[PDB]
Ligand binder design. Structure first.
Ligand SMILES: COc1ccc(S(=O)(=O)N(CC(C)C)C[C@@H](O)[C@H](Cc2ccccc2)NC(=O)O[C@@H]2C[C@@H]3NC(=O)O[C@@H]3C2)cc1
Ligand SMILES: [Cl-]
Ligand SMILES: [Cl-]
Ligand code: NA
Ligand code: NA
Lengths: 99, 99
């Protein structure tokens, strides 16, 4: 698709068999999802946003569908105002910004 | 142009007579620039993200040249760690996300 930006670019994702809403966020290096259960081991990561740096859980090689496109990559889990799909997965679905 | 997302989508902007680097950010409702003076009236605002909230000054009707494309709108000024071009100005330059 071609998504204009008059409204938030919210899409449906599927992770762990569950549908969730997420924001397609070119200003995010990383994908961050609200508290949920994911399989496997995690590692620590500090990420910095508008209000400062926080701790999140990094899960690698997680299967996630984004607006119907399959991705397999790193998902960070922690407190966020909205689930955000960052560039690590936007590149896997072939997204670009155009003007 | 078509901007890929392998790297942060940074562009040059001109605002208040000054050249700055800023992130094209589809996950940002609003445009947020590091501390600088702008002319005209302003009012305080709180905006929030990962890490929490920051206080900013809201200036309306500010012209900003973004990668060579002029656009006018509200600009928030405050202690952001990165200059952010949000959707309020991305729409005006015709930016879309494509995949
Ligand atoms: C109302 O207007 C606003 C309100 C909030 C924000 S924001 O900066 O908090 N933000 C909103 C989302 C969190 C919904 C825009 C983001 O694109 C933000 C933009 C941003 C802000 C500050 C520093 C870097 C990037 N990136 C971000 O938080 O990324 C997370 C935090 C880590 N940084 C990063 O690149 O990847 C990690 C994930 C911007 C304008
Ligand atoms: Cl505006
Ligand atoms: Cl349009
Ligand atoms: Na894993
Ligand atoms: Na003004």
């Amino acid at each position: 698709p071609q998504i204009t930006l008059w409204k938030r670019p919210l899409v449906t994702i599927k992770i762990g068999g569950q549908l969730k809403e997420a924001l397609l966020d070119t200003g995010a290096d990383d994908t961050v999802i609200e508290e949920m259960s994911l399989p496997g081991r995690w590692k620590p990561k500090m990420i910095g946003g508008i209000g400062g740096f926080i701790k999140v859980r990094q899960y690698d090689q997680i299967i996630i569908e984004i607006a119907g496109h399959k991705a397999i990559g790193t998902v960070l889990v922690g407190p966020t105002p909205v689930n955000i799909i960052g560039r690590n997965l936007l590149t896997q679905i072939g997204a670009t910004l155009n003007f």
